[PDB]
Automatic annotation (TrEMBL):
Covered range of the whole protein: 615 to 848 of 848
Organism: Staphylococcus phage 812
The protein's name in its UniProt record: GP-PDE domain-containing protein
Domain GP-PDE: 2-234
């Protein structure tokens, strides 16, 4: 009935994209932990929002210019926690948690291939998997079509900064499960139209109890939040 998504883990309470933060999101009632990924020089997936490590770590530079070993041996998150790889996260939580994973815009065939390889190896997608164990989101229509061609049962969320029938009609055309619009674009009229077309609506990024109350009234099916404790105050 409602999908509460821990945006980069529990970002409002601790550093983003750390295993401690992912666990804190689960402890504070998150249905899904949200992962952002970057490719290392040696083609491994790192949990990291930005293309560079400068904002959130004790290191500098593009993730693509360093090996996974170089990053994990030399640098930490600003709070001292390790910088986890996708493999670190999947090995730690396994099938006990649900993952909401973003692929790169513009479309990167290498990122998508490495992601599906690791998910398939853990049995989190393909034969034997639960449909809603993994949702994949992207701003890149091309990335979501690429995944839908290979694993048709993975629910896909189309990230958008604009909310109109054109985006909804593309969801219908390409077999996307959800539209995921910037919350400032959302109206009850647009949510009710999306629902009439069989789409789910996941709003981002919703940090105040007043915003949460407003979007639940408009009928959204889920939201991404940095402040999971505020959902309990509604």
């Amino acid at each position: 009935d409602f999908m509460l998504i821990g945006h980069r883990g529990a970002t409002g309470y601790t550093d983003e994209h750390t295993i401690k933060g992912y666990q804190m999101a689960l402890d504070k009632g998150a249905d899904y932990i949200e992962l952002d990924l970057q490719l290392t020089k040696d083609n491994k997936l790192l949990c990291m929002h930005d293309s560079t490590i400068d904002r959130t770590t004790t290191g500098t530079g593009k993730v693509g210019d360093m090996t996974l070993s170089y990053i994990q041996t030399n640098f930490t998150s600003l709070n001292g926690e390790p910088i986890p790889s996708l493999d670190d996260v999947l090995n730690h939580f396994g099938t006990k948690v649900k993952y909401y994973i973003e692929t790169k815009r513009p479309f990167d065939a290498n990122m998508d291939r490495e992601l599906l390889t690791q998910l398939k190896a853990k049995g989190l997608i393909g034969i034997g998997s639960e449909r809603f164990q993994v949702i994949i989101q992207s701003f890149a229509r091309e990335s979501l079509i690429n995944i839908h061609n290979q694993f048709s049962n993975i629910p896909l969320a189309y990230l958008t900064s604009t909310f109109s029938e054109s985006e909804m009609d593309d969801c219908l055309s390409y077999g996307f499960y959800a539209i995921a619009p910037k919350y400032t674009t959302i109206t009850k009229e647009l949510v009710d139209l999306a629902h009439s077309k069989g789409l789910k609506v996941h709003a981002w990024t919703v940090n105040t109890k007043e915003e949460m109350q407003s979007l639940i009234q408009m009928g959204v099916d889920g939201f991404f939040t940095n402040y999971l404790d505020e959902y309990k105050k509604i």
